[PDB]
Design a binder for this molecule. Structure first.
Ligand SMILES: CO[C@H]1[C@H](O[C@H]2/C=C/C=C\c3coc(n3)[C@H](C)[C@H](OC)C[C@H](O)/C=C/C=C/C=C\[C@H](C)[C@H]([C@@H](C)[C@@H](O)C[C@H](C)O)OC(=O)\C=C/C=C/C=C\C(C)=C\[C@H]2C)O[C@H](C)[C@@H](O)[C@@H]1OC
Ligand SMILES: Nc1ncnc2c1ncn2[C@@H]1O[C@H](COP(=O)(O)OP(=O)(O)OP(=O)(O)O)[C@@H](O)[C@H]1O
Ligand SMILES: [Mg+2]
Length: 359
């Protein structure tokens, strides 16, 4: 009886088997219909004849009919399993409405007929993936970035910070500053190349101006990238200006504070007797935390805001692109967890509202 772990994101579904150290399936959270329907890589493959939709926006499920197709495709096509023989752990955004929790639970028991399920908060799973139950997570993915302070397994809802700026916006920005330079990147196919360039050559500068100032006076920070058609292109200060937007959101016209400031604000919204612990346990998760140098930069920026009495420590494990999923694979593997599952029998007597009492 293997447990399934499905982490649904705004951009990517990460799904697999409890016990594994990595998700077996990772594909786009997209459903396509013509001008019945296609999902994932095949919807992306046929994007030029389909209307694509993202059923999850800013980590929240907003299209339930399409969400059912993504789950159907995850179970039957990607993982190649029957949903009725496996306990299924799902994940959810911070500050995710109660209605969503019930609908999600309802669909899992009434439509997929799962033997048991549980829903966990994504940031809490990332913290668990780091070997901690207390700390503050920065979760930055494709559609949204969140700061989630957590005390002994429990997210502190009153102190959560949300920033509507993540990887999708960074790719759009890298594309826009590459044109400004003089490169051409027009088609949707070409956009996928820019996303690839961002994941391979972008990084976070320790000091932006010294980097920007060095960029003007030298060719030490240049890197080449081979396009699919053989042609080789050089990118210099776009590498570090691309992810600077996380720290300076005004780069794409947004008034809000940067990830260092939201982190500090989040910590100052919490009770004073736990702040020492939050500062010492800043955990980074999500794909948009993957830029080299991002831990050191955060370390520096928090240090400037925080009292110097505080030990600051940023934990950014190399597997953090999937640390929600890894957290879920760990949690669903534990024998102590096997009672925490909501069972089909419990659902059949309590209804969808059983999820608020057990999760
Ligand atoms: C050893 O490998 C085995 C495998 O066993 C293992 C199953 C592993 C499953 C998934 C996995 C996914 O990625 C990894 N491992 C990597 C090794 C990972 O990358 C670096 C390291 C990982 O990120 C380490 C995390 C450490 C977490 C520590 C504490 C947590 C905060 C939990 C917390 C969730 C709990 O407090 C919640 C509460 C109950 O509500 O602490 C806890 O309390 C209780 C337990 C914590 C267990 C942690 C990890 C392991 C290794 C558990 C074995 C069981 O099982 C498969 C089936 C076998 O086949 C393998 O045999 C090869
Ligand atoms: N090595 C990398 N460097 C930079 N960015 C990366 C890297 N790998 C993945 N990303 C980006 O991370 C994003 C996907 O990450 P993730 O799965 O954490 O988000 P999600 O769960 O789909 O979305 P959200 O958490 O916003 O709902 C994509 O925009 C992708 O380009
Ligand atoms: Mg996510």
């Amino acid at each position: 009886t293997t447990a399934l772990v499905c982490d649904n994101g705004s951009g990517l579904v990460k799904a697999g088997f409890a016990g594994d150290d990595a998700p077996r399936a990772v594909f786009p959270s997209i459903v396509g219909r013509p001008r019945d329907s296609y999902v994932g890589d095949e919807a992306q493959s046929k994007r030029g004849i389909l209307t694509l939709k993202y059923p999850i926006e800013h980590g929240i499920i907003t299209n339930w009919d399409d969400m059912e197709k993504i789950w159907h495709h995850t179970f039957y096509n990607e993982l190649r399993v029957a949903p009725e023989e496996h306990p299924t752990l799902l994940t959810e955004a911070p500050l995710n409405p109660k209605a969503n929790r019930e609908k999600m639970t309802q669909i899992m028991f009434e439509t997929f007929n799962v033997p048991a399920m549980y829903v966990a908060i994504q940031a809490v799973l990332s913290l668990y993936a780091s070997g901690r139950t207390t700390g503050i997570v920065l979760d930055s993915g494709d559609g949204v970035t969140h700061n989630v302070p957590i005390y002994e397994g429990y997210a502190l809802p009153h102190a959560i910070m949300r920033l509507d700026l993540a990887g999708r916006d960074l790719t759009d920005y890298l594309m826009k500053i590459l044109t400004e330079r003089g490169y051409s990147f027009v088609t949707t196919a070409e956009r996928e190349i820019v996303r690839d360039i961002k994941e391979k050559l972008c990084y976070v500068a320790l000091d932006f101006e010294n980097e920007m100032a060095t960029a003007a006076s030298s060719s030490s920070l240049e890197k080449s990238y081979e396009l699919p058609d053989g042609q080789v292109i050089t990118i210099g200060n776009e590498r570090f200006r691309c992810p600077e937007t996380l720290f300076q959101p005004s780069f794409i016209g947004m008034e809000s504070a940067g990830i260092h400031e939201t982190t500090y604000n989040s910590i100052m919204k919490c009770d004073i007797d736990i702040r020492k612990d939050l500062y010492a346990n800043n955990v980074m998760s999500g794909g948009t935390t993957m830029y080299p140098g991002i831990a050191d930069r955060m370390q520096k920026e928090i240090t400037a805001l925080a009292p110097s009495t505080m030990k600051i420590k940023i934990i950014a494990p190399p597997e953090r692109k999937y640390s929600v999923w890894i957290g879920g694979s760990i949690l669903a593997s534990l024998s102590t967890f096997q009672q925490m599952w909501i069972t089909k029998q419990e659902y059949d007597e309590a209804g969808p509202s059983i999820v608020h009492r057990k999760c």
